């Protein structure tokens, strides 16, 4: 994964 | 992994002024930029997100602009609540911050009242000597304080402390403490504090002779 | 009412381990990524770590990678930062922060931060302060006012609290932020400006409380004859 991608549930 | 630099590092402005803080990225971050406000002893609070979007509840006098490598934060009309430090953050390549811009209150240049304090006999009995120079209610914060022992400039033996800007008179106050061993202290006579400040046409020196106070 | 409360900061010796905690309320904690950010006087704001909503993906700043570890117990609404092999540079206020809401955006920042927890990595032992008078004199006077105060020196850890005349004196006081001495101990001054007329008929006592050492020193400040 990319660090700055959506870190939350249900992206 | 992107370096953000802000300018200026300190901004002095009056209530009602329009102020502009710029932020520069070492490489393009598109619009992935955030603006934070931080007051002393408090956490940073998000003001603007993705370059221009005001967060809920943030007054409209705040606005952010820009894209790529150049960004600006503008306050249309300064309120006393807005005097704080402002950080920009890029959030496209990890999360890095600028060094901050302290927006302080501007006032008339005020020269410092310089007081000096000899070490207490109670401290000398313990075998140490601390001399304290106090600069009171002065603006701007930048000040030079040079300790002299028998006119010999001291180096590495002093520590300075400065208050936060006062709310009432918007002035600063500063203390410098020269610490010597009792045996180094008892070797010289005149202990002096030379202060160089914008409100002073010439450097002011307050001094005492050992054993005469 | 999104709220984050950090805890677990304190004074530790270099090379030891400290685990910070962060507790969340006002939002579904299980559904959000979370961050740790720290701030020193000399390193500004520095991002430390991020952890995905489910605790899987974890990313670290190079300055802490290999030594620090981020984790979370979603059944307890708690984020953790496990610090190992602490060094002096790790002294900072550590903030926990919540990831920004899910949207069509591809890149994500943070939106709400906690109030912070202070970590102090120090090769120093708890010590009560020695309180020394800053006596008024002709060399501490200006236009009918005189300056007097107290040197609170060689104490650890922070903070100390100063009051004057048991709190009955509150105007004219400037208490300075403590400096860290190369000895590892802290020193600060507290000064007050009073009328020179009062020095003959008004007693001034600085009251220093240092809760870590359970010290309470009352030091009367007397004028000097110079």
* Cβ neighbours for C104, distance < 8 A, ≥ 6 positions apart: none
What dihedral do alpha carbons B129, B135, B137, B140 form, nearest 10°? -130
B49 to chain A: which residues are within 8 Å by CB? none
CA–CA gap between residue B70 and residue C115 (Å, rounded): 30
Q: Which of B59, B84, B105 is the last residue of a domain?
A: B105
Q: Which of B105, B124, B157 is the last residue of a domain?
A: B105
B117 touches chain A (CB under 8 A): no
Our CA-based measurement puts residue C185 at a distance from the nearest CA of chain A, in whole angstroms, of 40
> The domain containing residue B21 runs over which residues?
4-105
Extents of the domains making up chain C: 3-121, 130-220
CB of C156 closer than 8 Å to CB of C128: no
- Is C62 in the A-facing interface, judged by CB distances under 8 Å? no
Determine whether the interchain pair C107/B91 forms a contact, defined as Cβ–Cβ distance below 8 Å. yes
The encoded tokens of residue B130 equal: 């601390």
A3/C137 Cα distance (integer angstroms): 62
Facing A8 at nearest CB: one of C32, C106, C107? C32
Cα C36 to the chain's mean position, in Å? Answer: 17
The Cβ-side half-sphere exposure at B81, using a 13 Å CA radius, reads 5
Cα separation, B175 vs B162, whole angstroms: 6
- DSSP β-ladder status, B101-105 and B10-13: parallel
d(CA C92, CA B137): 30
The number of helices, as runs of H, and strands, as runs of E, in chain A is 0, 0
State whether B131 and B74 are in the same domain. no
Query: Which of C37, C6, C35, C19 is CA-nearest to residue C82?
Result: C19
The DSSP letter of residue B165 is P
Is the C-alpha dihedral spanning B125, B130, B133, B134 positive or negative?
negative
Identify the sign of the CA torsion C180, C181, C183, C185: negative
Cα(C225)–Cα(B191) distance, integer angstroms? 17
First to last CA, chain B: 58
Same domain, B89 and B117: no
Cα separations (Å) of C71 from B33, C52, C80, C84, C192?
27, 9, 5, 14, 48
Is C170 in a helix, a strand, or coil? coil
Residue of C nearest to A6 (CA): C108
Kindly state the helix (H) or strand (E) to which residue B183 belongs, with its residue range.
Answer: helix B182-185
Q: Do A7 and C107 touch (CB under 8 A)?
A: no
CB atoms < 10 A from the CB of A2, how many?
Answer: 10
Specify whether B95 is located in the same domain as B12.
yes
Q: Are residues B132 and B184 in the same domain?
A: yes
By C-alpha distance, which of B160, B37, B177, B175 is closest to B97? Answer: B37
B100/B138 same-domain check: no
Mutate to test the interface with C, among B23, B122, B175, B204 (most CBs of C within 10 A): B175
* Beta-sheet strands, E only, within B79-171: 85-90, 96-97, 101-105, 113-117, 128-138, 144-149, 152-153, 158-162
Per-residue tokens: C186: 């802290």
Which stretch of DSSP H or E encloses residue B99?
none
Burial of A10 (0-12, 13-18, 19+ CB in 10 A): exposed
- Residue closest to B176 by CA, chosen among B132, B120, B115, B129: B132
Among B72, B105, B138, the domain boundary falls at: B105
Position of tokens 């949207």? C103
Using an 8 Å Cβ cutoff, are A10 and C102 in contact? yes
- Close Cβ partners of B201 (under 8 Å, ≥ 6 residues apart): none
Rg (chain C; Cα; Å): 23
For residue C159, is the peptide bond before it cis, meaning its omega torsion is within 30 degrees of 0?
yes
Q: Are residues B100 and B134 in the same domain?
A: no
Domain count, chain B: 2
Task: Output the domain CATH number for residue B60.
Answer: 2.60.40.10
Among B8, B12, B37, B2, residue whose Cα is nearest residue B23? B8
Same domain assignment for residues B25 and B95:
yes
CA distance C102 to chain B (A): 14
Method: X-ray
Instruction: Name the class of domain C3-121.
Output: mainly beta
Residue of A nearest to C106 (CA): A5
In this structure, the number of other CB atoms found within 10 A of the CB of residue C153 comes to 24
Q: What is the CATH number of domain C130-220?
A: 2.60.40.10
Tell me, yes or no, whether B36 and B94 share the same domain: yes
Which tokens is C177 given?
Answer: 């932020």
Segment holding C94, helix H or strand E: strand C92-99
The experimental resolution of this structure, in angstroms, equals: 2.2
Tell me, yes or no, whether B59 and B12 share the same domain.
yes
Query: Do C3-121 and C130-220 agree at the fold level?
Result: yes
Q: Which residues contact C168 (CB under 8 A, 6 or more apart)?
A: none
| DSSP assignments along C107-135, one per residue | S--EEEE---EEEEE-S---BPPEEEEE-
């Amino acid at each position: 994964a990319n660090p700055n991608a959506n870190p939350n549930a249900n992206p | 992994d992107i370096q953000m630099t802000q300018s200026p590092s300190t901004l002095s402005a009056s209530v009602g002024d329009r102020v502009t803080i710029t932020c520069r990225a070492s490489q393009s971050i598109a619009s992935w930029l955030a603006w934070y406000q931080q007051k002393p002893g408090k956490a940073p609070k998000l003001l603007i997100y993705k370059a221009s979007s005001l967060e809920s509840g943030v007054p409209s006098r705040f606005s952010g602009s820009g894209s790529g490598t150049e960004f600006t934060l503008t306050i249309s009309s300064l309120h006393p609540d807005d005097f704080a430090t402002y950080f920009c953050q890029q959030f496209t390549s990890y999360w890095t911050f600028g060094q901050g811009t302290k927006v302080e209150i501007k006032r008339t240049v005020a020269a410092p009242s310089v007081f000096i304090f000899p070490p207490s006999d109670e401290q000398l009995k313990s075998g140490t000597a601390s001399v304290v120079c106090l600069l009171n209610n002065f603006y701007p914060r930048e000040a030079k304080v040079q300790w002299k022992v028998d006119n010999a400039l001291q180096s590495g033996n002093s520590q300075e402390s400065v208050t936060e800007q006062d709310s009432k008179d918007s002035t600063y106050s500063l203390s410098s403490t020269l610490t010597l061993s009792k045996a180094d202290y008892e070797k010289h006579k005149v202990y002096a504090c030379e202060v160089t400040h914008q409100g002073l046409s010439s450097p002011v020196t307050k001094s005492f002779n050992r054993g005469e106070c | 009412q999104v709220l984050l409360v950090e805890s677990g900061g304190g004074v530790v010796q270099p090379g030891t381990s400290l685990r910070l905690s962060c507790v969340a309320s006002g939002f579904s904690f299980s559904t959000y990524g979370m961050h740790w950010v720290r701030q020193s006087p000399g390193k500004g704001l520095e991002w430390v770590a991020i952890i995905w909503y489910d605790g899987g993906n974890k990313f670290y700043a190079d300055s802490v990678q290999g030594r620090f570890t981020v984790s979370r117990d979603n059944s307890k609404n708690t984020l953790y930062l496990q610090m190992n092999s602490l060094r002096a540079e790790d002294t900072a206020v550590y903030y926990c922060a919540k990831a920004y809401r899910t949207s069509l955006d591809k890149k994500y920042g943070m939106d709400v931060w906690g109030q912070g927890t202070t970590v102090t990595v120090s090769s120093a032992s708890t010590k009560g302060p020695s309180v020394f008078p800053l006596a008024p004199s002709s060399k501490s006077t200006s236009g009918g006012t005189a300056a007097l105060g107290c040197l609170v020196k060689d104490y650890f850890p922070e903070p100390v609290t100063v009051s004057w005349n048991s709190g009955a004196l509150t105007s004219g006081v400037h208490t300075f932020p403590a400096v860290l001495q190369s000895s590892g101990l802290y020193s600060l001054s507290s000064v007050v400006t009073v009328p020179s007329s009062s020095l003959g008929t008004q007693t001034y006592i600085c009251n220093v409380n240092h809760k870590p050492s359970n010290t309470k020193v009352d030091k009367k400040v007397e004028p000097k004859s110079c």
